[PDB]
């Protein structure tokens, strides 16, 4: 099946790139939502046609970065008292036009848990979707190829540029040694890739000149802004991948900005 689906494989990608959520959730939703790529769900006592409002909520549980969703948490708390049940919740769910409620407010749906549990819930979901995707790339020895670890970035970025696309292919020439990329050395990077919004902010002085800080303190300032450490080699391939200009560094227009605008 050569050219059977290399239109829909790009089309569904184009849908998942930028499109309306209507057909997006029509692909039932119970767990088909994992199609959003290309152990929480065991606890998903959901109802197949759940909603698209929760969907809008759901992707934001992966879209909203770390420090910001605290405000979404606060915005969720219009009743104050550190807690808000479905009254405000399901209302702002309705304004667009269940398992999470059973997961938050219990199967009774009434007992209002501390909405501080919005964070940890956001933590594992970001992990699980990243987890399942890590198996989709078939981690050999618990590790994946640098062209896979770079591939998911492209799958994350969702950009259409033939050059860097080929650079993703050409990396085996730039990296023929082979090390494999573990699930932890990629999860830490995405948490950084999540909080990109503040990095460029923290990097503004560099942004006033450029070069994205020589790839090493980049990793250092990453841990500062991202609250999580990365290794050295993990980012060397990233700078090797996105070095479109061949300068050995990045401009904001090289790597950062594309990430920044990705939050659309």
């Amino acid at each position: 099946s050569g050219f059977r689906d290399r239109k829909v494989m790009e089309y569904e990608n184009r849908i998942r790139a930028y499109s309306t959520p209507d057909k997006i959730f029509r692909y039932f939703t119970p767990e088909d939502f994992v199609r959003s790529i290309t152990s929480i769900f065991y606890t998903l006592g959901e109802c197949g046609l759940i909603s698209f409002s929760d969907y809008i909520f759901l992707t934001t549980v992966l879209s909203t970065p770390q420090r910001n969703f605290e405000i979404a948490f606060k915005m969720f708390d219009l009743n104050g008292d550190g807690e808000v049940d479905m009254e405000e919740f399901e209302q702002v769910q309705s304004i667009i036009r269940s398992a999470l409620t059973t997961y938050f407010f219990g199967a009774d749906l009434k007992g209002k848990l501390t909405i501080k549990n919005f964070l940890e819930f956001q933590r594992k979901l970001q992990h699980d979707v990243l987890k399942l995707e890590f198996e989709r790339h078939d981690p050999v020895d618990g590790r994946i190829t640098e062209r896979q670890f770079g591939g998911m970035l492209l799958a994350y970025s969702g950009v259409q540029s033939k050059k860097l696309t080929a650079m993703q292919r050409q990396l085996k020439k730039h990296f023929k040694e082979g090390k494999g990329l573990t699930f932890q050395e990629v999860e830490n990077f995405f948490t950084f890739l999540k909080n990109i919004n503040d990095v460029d902010t923290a990097l503004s002085f560099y942004h006033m000149a450029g070069a994205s800080l020589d790839k090493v303190t980049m990793q250092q300032v990453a841990r500062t802004v991202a609250k999580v450490e990365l290794s050295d080699h993990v980012c060397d391939v990233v700078f090797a991948l996105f070095d479109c200009d061949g300068n050995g560094e990045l401009s904001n227009k090289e790597f950062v900005s594309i990430m920044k605008q990705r939050l659309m």
Binding site: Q160, S161, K162, K163, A166
Partner: protein, 53 residues
Amino acid sequence: VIVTRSGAILPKPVKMSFGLLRVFSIVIPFLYVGTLISKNFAALLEEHDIFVP
């Protein structure tokens, strides 16, 4: 035909003033441009996402 029907011989055909060197220096200067506007154009496709080797 080489000879006319009367039996005479057709006149001398007319070349053009060592045109062989004239053409030879209208092909090459427009052949060298062939290399340029190709290489320049392909490199111009590196500037964008239209194509890449």
